[PDB]
Amino acid sequence: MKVHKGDTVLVISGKDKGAKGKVLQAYPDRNRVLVEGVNRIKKHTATQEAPIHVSNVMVVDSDGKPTRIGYRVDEETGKRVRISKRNGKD
Amino acid sequence: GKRTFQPNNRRRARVHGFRLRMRTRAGRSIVSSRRRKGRRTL
Amino acid sequence: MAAVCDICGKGPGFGKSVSHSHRRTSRRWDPNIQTVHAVTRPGGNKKRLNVCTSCIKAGKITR
Amino acid sequence: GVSPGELRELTDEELAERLRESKEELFNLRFQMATGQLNNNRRLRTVRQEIARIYTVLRERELGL
């Protein structure tokens, strides 16, 4: 995954398609993440958010529509800058 | 008269122990076969 | 007394014994090894040496 | 805990003294483990790692460094 806890994503598939929210947790090998307010589970003791597979979401560029995460050349003493297409900024 | 087997581990070691297998060239070849098959030896 | 010649490496030959009916069996051709004492210089200690006859004809000849 | 470089700036006796201190630390902590009087369990790992650092510093100290 190219996404971490500080990113906001849009659900692009599934019954929750259209939902946005902040990433709360990630499980790399499973490639599943927790997103506030997406897949609710009406079970508590004995609306809990469930992990969803990354390919059903797309990272929002924080400046409009969903975008694809890309990399460039910057380095600057060990610092990989993460950008995107269509006016990438971070 | 009516018996079949009367175990005694000391004797078992001195007779069937792998130390005795090491004593001979033949015994060593036995052990090396057991290693390849993957078994716990005597 | 067919030990490999101490000073040559001559060992025994192995092969067959062709009987009248051509029936083969196993036999051995041991070299004619004789017992001699080993001497390196005049008045030596006379150790021992199992040696082939060809060397008795020429080589470590003591007595 | 203590950084390896900080350990490397010490000569000999400071190393032995810190070593003894850490062994006493494990000596106490595992007794607290035996009796249940301890929450911070990872402290054991910290101290064991410190000891290992001490020994490797000693070997490199005598040998090529």
Binding site: - | - | - | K23, E24, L26, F27, N28, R30, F31, Q32, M33, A34, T35, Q37, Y55, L58
Partner: protein, 98 residues
């Protein structure tokens, strides 16, 4: 490396029996199954700066606990019973009577 007696004693044995043994300052510890009575007296007397009267050692086997198919086995830890002499200083195992 050299002169390290603290690695011999691993812990104090916590049981009703070891509680009863507190009388006359007799304390039970788990030890490395390599050491002996002499290392134990030397280490304890040095570490705690006390007088040990005598030490009665024992080995003990673990229990062969069953799994879903096969069997396991816990460690067969060696232990030792340290009897302190009359007049020596009692030691405080962190306020842990057992």
């Amino acid at each position: 490396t050299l002169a390290d007696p603290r690695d011999i004693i691993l812990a104090p044995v916590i049981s009703e029996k070891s509680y009863g043994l507190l009388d006359d300052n007799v304390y039970t510890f788990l030890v490395r199954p390599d050491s002996n009575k002499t290392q134990i007296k030397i280490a304890v007397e040095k570490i705690f700066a006390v007088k040990v009267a005598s030490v009665n050692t024992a080995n003990r086997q673990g229990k062969r606990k069953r799994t879903r198919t096969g069997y396991g086995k816990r460690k067969s830890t060696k232990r030792a019973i340290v009897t302190l002499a009359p007049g020596s200083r009692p030691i405080d195992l962190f306020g842990a009577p057992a």
